[PDB]
Amino acid sequence: GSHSEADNYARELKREQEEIIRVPDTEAAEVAEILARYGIEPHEYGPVVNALRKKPQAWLDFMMKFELGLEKPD
Amino acid sequence: GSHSEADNYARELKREQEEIIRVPDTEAAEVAEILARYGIEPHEYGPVVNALRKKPQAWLDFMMKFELGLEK
Ligand SMILES: [Fe+2]
Ligand SMILES: [Fe+2]
Ligand SMILES: [Zn+2]
Ligand SMILES: [Zn+2]
Ligand SMILES: [Zn+2]
Ligand SMILES: [Zn+2]
Ligand SMILES: [Zn+2]
Ligand SMILES: [Zn+2]
Ligand SMILES: [Zn+2]
Numbered sequence: 001g002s003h004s005e006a007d008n009y010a011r012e013l014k015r016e017q018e019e020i021i022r023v024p025d026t027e028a029a030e031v032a033e034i035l036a037r038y039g040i041e042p043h044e045y046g047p048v049v050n051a052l053r054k055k056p057q058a059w060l061d062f063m064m065k066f067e068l069g070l071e072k073p074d
Numbered sequence: 075g076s077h078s079e080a081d082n083y084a085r086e087l088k089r090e091q092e093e094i095i096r097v098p099d100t101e102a103a104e105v106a107e108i109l110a111r112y113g114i115e116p117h118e119y120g121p122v123v124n125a126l127r128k129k130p131q132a133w134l135d136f137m138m139k140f141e142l143g144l145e146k
Binding site for chain 2: 059
């Protein structure tokens with residue numbers, strides 16, 4: 001009918017947290033790749049990546065926005 | 075008549091570029107506040123903000139994607 005199953009946001013959010021847990025080193029590389037697109041260098045974004053890694057909740061929301069182009073609702 | 079998807083981006087690109095030229099420091103603050111949203115501390119996001127300022131087109135692209143949600 002009209003849809004009420006856990007939306008693309010709920011699903012992607014599930015996916016993205018499991019990746020962060022299982023292959024953090026791959027998701028770190030994803031952040032480097034995103035920031036490098038804007039001419040930023042490792043010495044500049046190295047500390048940003050390393051900060052996000054220490055903060056699983058922050059990291060999840062960052063990946064939702066910068067990788068998947070999805071905002072946290074409200 | 076027509077309202078091109080190209081035209082709206084060029085409209086939005088013009089406006090944003092004019093900001094960057096007239097009020098760069100205000101535009102820099104926009105980046106800092108988006109990064110700081112995700113618990114990245116000034117000592118960590120500062121050089122990224124400083125890196126975008128030195129690459130104006132990258133800076134512009136970064137606003138266009140992450141402030142306005144648009145792509146090329
Ligand atoms: Fe990711
Ligand atoms: Fe802006
Ligand atoms: Zn239906
Ligand atoms: Zn349907
Ligand atoms: Zn993923
Ligand atoms: Zn991934
Ligand atoms: Zn018309
Ligand atoms: Zn019209
Ligand atoms: Zn602005």
